[PDB]
């Protein structure tokens, strides 16, 4: 049912979580300490009035992984509660691994995306190595224990993305989506090598988007048209996944293409260092414009832009930090409504 | 292009040749049967300044008709007649359809044949029936089309054979209401390795709902599955020259609601009575008959007249940038299906 070997546990919180679980269950404590011998880990022996002693060993493997042995002692039917609690304290995406190859990249197109992704909070990047053929960069997180390995074989133009799809991976691919072709975009969103979105009749997806956009359609940028049609192709060809929450990336990256742009046309450009923060405040959930901007603008436009930026950034935070298809399509329909409202 | 082994309407070969020749302002040398044991038509024609163009037209034993312009002293001239006769052929005569649909029995196949025979120039017969295999023929009197329907009742297999023409189109249009996803796929795209079985049905559901709006939840469930599958086919459709059959869901949906609403407004459309007894045709747009404009609101009258105009026109054009055209038609049909619900 579950294997308790080699887990991705935030180690400095392990003992604290175990203790909080025990205190929640109104249990008793026998002993909590390091493990005997030279094997690094945590021995936790706990019980409650009426049963026997449940023993749980926690091996710190050399790999940073953390193995659990609840199958030790006199009560495993009881230690399994702690084992499963700690196992479920893991953010689920930590269990999947990603490793893929994208064709047609060069250092000059990769360093801008790395800088754009490093514009984030607890996400920064370094260059790990560089020889004649391949230059490899790292991305690191401070909240999670997440690292992401970006590799460039410059001799063949290959970009090799390795790691675990978490906060870092999501930020990197979101900044990357604007450059991907159809098949590359599909590959990053569904995390698979044999995609299916290249076979949708793109004219029917175009009809779909045009039907939803109406007057706002012909005013669209060509990059936005190709991106949204491609994302709709993916949504229509998406294989059965556990969490489709990433399939909203076409819409979101489209919003910044319309949001920043039109906003920069109203005397308030959003640069990378200046960011969004200098124009908005957060009272409660919906973001607001600063008062110094409610004077030159029509109230309709202020309502539109405030709802748009309220949706955005919130969705980035809900996606980058941590019947699903129905949820995804509701989200995407709201995003299309916002994109249309921004033009009219 | 290959001018060998063609399907030429025999009763028009000589006349089409003569009118083509007089169109090109040529002269006639001879037009007659062929000498020797090959039955056919030898046509020798020319114009002032060149030599005699000879064209042989071999009547095969199978009814097929081969043209040999690669004969005589003037072939650069006979190729004009070869191309004229070659292009007087309706294109679907060169393609053949032959497919298997699983899960059928005589009691569920005979209704579709009867409903298709309710048409004007479309009739069908029982070819044979044994223990294992039952075979029907579908014949046209306006065209010269036959479609062979076979039912292996022992495995529930239905074998459709022939040429996708008037008969095939009427048959599959009546059949679409009963087909699963893969069967509907097979008849609309006329291929065995389809692509519509891999579409995310929830996104097609979102598309249909987006176009229908208030009229969406009022829709019958079978119509829902039909339209979702038709949109699935439209979205996964391999590259075809003519997608005009992918509009069969929408059309079959309109006929499904039109008859419905009419039957709900005191005028049932039966199979023997048909649609003809309920509408009149002044000029191009159909109208409802006057005996029905009194109990109904004029809005409803205009809506229903546009709907039946749409159905009859599209069926008539089907029974006798294409993706953009098809999607425009489907948008019109969706607008009509929505308007029907008021």
What share of residues of chain A is helical?
40-55%
| Biggest protein-protein contact in the assembly | A-B, 20 and 21 residues
| Gap from first CA to last CA of chain A | 54 Å
Oligomeric state of the chains present here: homodimer
How would the global form of chain A be characterised? globular
| DSSP helical segment count of chain A | 10
Main β-sheet, spatial strand arrangement of chain A: 5-9-8-7-6
Strand content of chain A: 15-25%
- Major beta sheet of chain A, specifics? 5 strands, antiparallel
N-to-C series of helices and strands of chain A: HEEEEHEHEEEEHHHHHEEHH
Structure summary, number of beta strands of chain A: 11
Helix/strand structural class of chain A:
alpha+beta
Taking Cα atoms only, what radius of gyration of chain A do you get, to the nearest Å?
A: 24 Å
